[PDB]
Design a protein around this nucleic acid. Structure first.
Lengths: 110, 25, 63
RNA sequence: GAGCCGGUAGCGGGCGUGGAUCCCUGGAUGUCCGAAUGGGGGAACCCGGCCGGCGGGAACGCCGGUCACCGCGCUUUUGCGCGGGGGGAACCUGGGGAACUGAAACAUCUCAGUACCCAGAGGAGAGGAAAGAGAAAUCGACUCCCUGAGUAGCGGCGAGCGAAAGGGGACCAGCCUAAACCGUCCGGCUUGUCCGGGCGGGGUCGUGGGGCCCUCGGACACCGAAUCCCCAGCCUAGCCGAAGCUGUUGGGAAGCAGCGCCAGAGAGGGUGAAAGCCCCGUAGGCGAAAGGUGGGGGGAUAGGUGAGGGUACCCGAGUACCCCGUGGUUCGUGGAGCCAUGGGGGAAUCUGGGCGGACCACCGCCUAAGGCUAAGUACUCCGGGUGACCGAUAGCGCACCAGUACCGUGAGGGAAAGGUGAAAAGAACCCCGGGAGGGGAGUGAAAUAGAGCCUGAAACCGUGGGCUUACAAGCAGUCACGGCCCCGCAAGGGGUUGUGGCGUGCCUAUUGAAGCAUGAGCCGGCGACUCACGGUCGUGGGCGAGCUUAAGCCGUUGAGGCGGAGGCGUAGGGAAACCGAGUCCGAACAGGGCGCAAAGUCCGCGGCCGUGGACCCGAAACCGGG
RNA sequence: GGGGAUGACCCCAGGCGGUAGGGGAGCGUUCCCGAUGCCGAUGAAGGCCGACCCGCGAGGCGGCUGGAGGUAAGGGAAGUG
RNA sequence: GACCCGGUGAAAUUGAACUGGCCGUGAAGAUGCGGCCUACCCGUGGCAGGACGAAAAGACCCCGUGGAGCUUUACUGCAGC
């Protein structure tokens, strides 16, 4: 990690969990100001960019794999028809309703 | 402290300052 | 790096800072010449011009 | 730390916070070939002994396991139990060991102890405490840098080849062994007194050892390894980890605009178009191990050497030395030595014996004819960084189903092919059609972005228009004028041409060139006077005495600084002795060299020259291993 | 050569065909400076066309193209034409 | 077979070309230089003469103090005797 490429190298060649590193982000008021450690991968979010900028949505599939995630909102319909989930670019994921009814969720980040 | 720097800075800022070269002795 | 036909440097060949050079008369003698006396009065130094250039040069550095 | 059954997207079915996928290390399996070694053998396949379960052996019988090549010592016994080998891109040393080419031929020679082939050790080997050096009575491992010297000099003295002690620097360290003398003894001859070999004595550093007599004297000296846990370094992932939102043109914004913060971390990348504050597991920095490798550093382990005089002396080699015939060396047979040896002679053990280049006298130097010795220089398979390095015809030839596709019998040769998109949302359905492929519809920021689908120019083929075309030469054309057509830079140009004037292409190499001499069919990309060290003259400029090595230290940026062996000017004349602004010839005041400062010197850029493959490609051929 | 302010202007003299070849001076090309240098989604580049600048090798500029750059008013560098 | 039909659909050489005969000319055997004479625009089946036609950077030549095979009382050496 001292050159532009070792980034990819460690990032996805080493811990997929590093990809979780990718998971990293932030959220609403409460939680966020509250602090900034430990998360939920699958939590609620709003997209702060793209036409979909400022759009209300929920995180369903934490998809560190393809290096991003899927939220019910950020979705598009096909051409044949059927509607389906959009490839969501980590980059503008704002979490807020901090998924926590899950005791463990609470324990870890709120 | 670098904020202290902030300080001496307030003391004599300028574009020449922008130039700015750090020398101790 | 570099050198001199160290040879001509040695047989005949030397420079006075003038940037010029001499070698021995060499007109006969030191081989045949039952020849003479006054001619023998012919072996102090010879100063060949212009050419004393490939000369000088090739020697360049030391002498 | 919460997703996963790899690159395959798909189906069909599944695992995991009663720390899954995966990162690491340390595990068992580990089919068959390949030193192959159990035997054979066109590898990757076919053959053999014991244990092996006992296996179906339904009222009938296995694989599996296993197991043994040979060179190596030696506990010899009947030999049991050790080491080897097979690799390896380049690096090392030794064994062996070449033509071209330069000398403008070519026999010496150079290319070189170069290429190659070989054996072998390593992680580095090389080598390495002196029969040295040199000579100031001085120096002291071996190696590697600079310097010394392109000197001293080797030489059809022709091309060329060309050192070393000393100074500077990095590094630093030292130890044995036969070496019979002693004793120990074993085993012998055959008892003595002989050699013999396992034990110590010594087991030599700069000469002593041993053996005799008295002085001894009575504890800090660890190498190359041995040892502890040490920071054991690393081994991959370790983890924290500062700080803006609202507006807004936008298909998108991180952008314009408003105001808000960070900050020893305004290194860079990823983010739908360029953000310090959005992602970044980055620089700020802290971080961290139960495994697998150190120096340091600590200890004992510690091995291990460590004083005095005497005495008739016994104590590291089988050959030095010499003569012939070769080697290294700078030495090309030479006035020609030192070491190393091929072949014959065949010494001396301290007044021994080589040495200082023929030799002789005296001096000075060293102590051979055994062994080990980390570190200071080389090298790159591999990991990291960094680049006035490259951008797919450039980089390694290969940026990803390439040393493979393919000609080769074989050894061997050896391509080309990257990019759509922001992400597929990749194109249902409808339409002609055998279909592909074409039209609609939907994505959409565009799809004349549409799947070999970015930017996709030229060559060249098409489809529409303007003009122009049948008594006419020429590439070409271009100067004039006219007719018709367009006037987004209008009373002037645009394109086209009927006529008319004058008019032999282009490039190489040529006395001379349309050329019928060459060159070249078209367009697009590659493509040829450079670098390095010398030297040189020009000059820009820093002192005139001017100037720098190797190195040591300082280093986001990472900053240059300090180093004073040396080498070029400071007179030179000579062959030299040597003298010297004089100096050689000579014995004569006659000339040649010089004196005459006019002074350089370093660095920078530049015309050039020498060695370099060195303006570029171009053959026959000689040589090496296959 | 006669003054030149830096240009430049003027007079005359005074030529100015040119290969090997020798001397001066410019041009664009991808790079390193960003010598108290930064343009661009209302386009970086390259492309596609042109009756203002240069003696010129080139400039500028306007139009259409296309998706992402990269320039450097000045010196430095070279796999340059 | 050629020729006409339908299906298929290369190749060397090539600057480029809308390329006459003449008599002359030039480097000396010219379609494109001069004066002149015929001469309409295109094509396919043909005939070979010219385009010094193609193929090949003469192998006959000479030149480079070029190469490789063989020869003897050429030089020098090595082998084996």
């Amino acid at each position: 990690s001292k050159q532009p490429d070792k980034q990819r190298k460690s990032q996805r060649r080493a811990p997929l969990h590093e990809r979780h590193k990718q998971v990293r982000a932030t959220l609403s008021a409460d939680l966020r100001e509250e602090y900034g450690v430990r998360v939920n991968a699958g939590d609620t979010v709003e997209v702060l960019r793209g036409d979909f900028a400022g759009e209300e949505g929920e995180v369903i599939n934490v998809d560190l794999d393809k290096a991003v995630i899927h939220v019910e909102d950020v979705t598009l319909e096909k051409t044949d028809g059927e509607e389906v989930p959009r490839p969501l670019d980590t980059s503008n994921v704002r979490v807020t309703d901090l998924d926590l009814e899950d005791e463990k969720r609470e324990a870890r980040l709120e | 402290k670098t904020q202290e720097v902030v300080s001496l800075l307030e003391a004599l800022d300028v574009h020449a300052d922008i130039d700015r070269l750090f020398v101790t002795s | 790096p570099k050198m001199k036909t160290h040879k001509m440097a040695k047989r005949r060949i030397k420079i006075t800072g003038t940037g010029k050079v001499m070698a021995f008369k060499s007109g006969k003698r030191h081989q045949n010449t039952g020849k003479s006396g006054d001619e023998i009065r012919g072996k102090g130094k010879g100063f060949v011009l212009a050419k004393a250039e490939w000369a000088r040069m090739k020697l360049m550095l030391p002498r």
